[PDB]
């Protein structure tokens, strides 16, 4: 057998969502900052198609790439590569990357707790690992500053009638819409989404992010004390960080309140504090979850293989 | 099974000398420069013992670690880890690292030739790969500036009698001595070295290096035109650049002349140019050799294993 390249990946999933990590074989992308590097990865597409697409990885698969830190205070940097795009920050993946680091030995595992400082495309992230018996049990990450752009704003949907929605950002751009004003959601999702880029034009005060990536159809959230449980659906991960930003923009969640995202295993998260971002209110999310490694692999490519990018 | 860490290595030998390369699992050592990083690797010892020592790697094994470049003009940096020490530059290994990069796909392979700029502990190195049919056939590296410290200097050897020797540096510190003034060698080797560290006390005008690493016993060299063929024993690659430096400090070799080192697969060399360094003359070695990849591996370490550093 012959290959034109070899990447070594350590498989890892967090509460179900796959978040494979590339530990070697791939040179750090060009760019002076991590942000730009992720961009390159998104434009080039060569790397994401090789690992994401088949016959190497079925649909709905994630794979994160470790890159040399570009920020003084950061032990390691990485880029999230979702089957759809390369977001500036992902919850489910910032969890896998945190886990692989510890379970693979790249970072020194301190018990019963170990503190890391990773650097995603969107910005630096604090991480608190709960390691026990040589294994990161639970990972708690301080996501980047999240916020809600528009709130209760009309939306001319060519679908049917007019409904009000809210746009937020908790690692990625979302457009939250109560399934009430909706009455297959996949179809109506693609619709409500595109419409938002048109009528509402999103903007991030610290990154060249200029669009609404997805739409999540939510349902009324219940309260059990300080723990709000919501059965929202586009997956989860950065989904909640965004919703909490809105939930906090409507007085439905105060600082110090823990939000529990639906069980895609229930993704935990808490509103650590409130911060002012780009002349606007923002929350400091605390996503937390459990990730297990699934193995290791070395992907290759035969030069005569008709699917160099994969079908 | 359980492990406390995982390093992914791609096996590679150059003309026989093993030069395995670590592509992932290992975080870049602490230090503002590559030089200092290699040092750390040498002091810490934790990494070199894990990979070099058994039961993971028999004696006489080399393993190079790829590290994020610290020099603007360098696609990749690495540290050489020899079973004895961590030299500032190694020929046989600068060849394997060059090869792995291309054959593993870390670097874009251009045919029929591809130019890289690697960064070893001692300094930047130009590399010219002869790639054909998706495989680096031959690797030509422009070693760091080599030179000869002392020439024909007395040496009080407690062994027997007094002999004259010469000290040089071509990636590492050596003390060349004609087997004529010797009349086994391995035993009287480390013996003549200590003497050099005493009577001749080495110094490199750019690196912390200040001692004689090894000793090579040589005999007269033959000539067949412009190609000098000679026998040497001490580590033949980095030994050449040291030799030529002396052969050049004695008139026994001129710029543009090729030097073929004994086949310990004869390691080729050429004295590209003559430059100045630290106030004294020096040569610009051009090592050449062929390398292949032996495969890939992921080393591990059970916590209950009584040999964490290997015996």
UniProtKB/Swiss-Prot annotation, chains A, B:
Family matches, as SUPFAM superfamilies: Diaminopimelate epimerase-like (SSF54506)
Swiss-Prot/TrEMBL catalytic activity: trans-4-hydroxy-L-proline = cis-4-hydroxy-D-proline
Residues engaged in binding substrate: 91-92, 237-238
Keyword Isomerase recorded: yes
InterPro entries associated with the record: Pro_racemase_fam
Its EC number(s): 5.1.1.8
Keyword Metal-binding attached: no
Keyword set, alphabetical order: Isomerase
UniProt GO molecular function: 4-hydroxyproline epimerase activity; trans-L-3-hydroxyproline dehydratase activity
Coiled-coil regions listed in the entry: none
Active-site residues annotated for this sequence: 90 (proton acceptor)
EC category: isomerase
Pfam families found in the cross-reference section: Pro_racemase (PF05544)
Similarity comment text for this entry: Belongs to the proline racemase family.
Subunit field text: Homotetramer.
NCBIfam families for the chain: T3LHypDht (NF047722)
Role this protein plays: In vitro, catalyzes the epimerization of trans-4-hydroxy-L-proline (t4LHyp) to cis-4-hydroxy-D-proline (c4DHyp) and that of trans-3-hydroxy-L-proline (t3LHyp) to cis-3-hydroxy-D-proline (c3DHyp), albeit with very low efficiency. The physiological substrate may be different. Displays neither proline racemase activity nor t3LHyp dehydratase activity.
This protein's name: Protein BMEI1586
Naturally occurring in which organism (per UniProt): Brucella melitensis biotype 1 (strain ATCC 23456 / CCUG 17765 / NCTC 10094 / 16M)
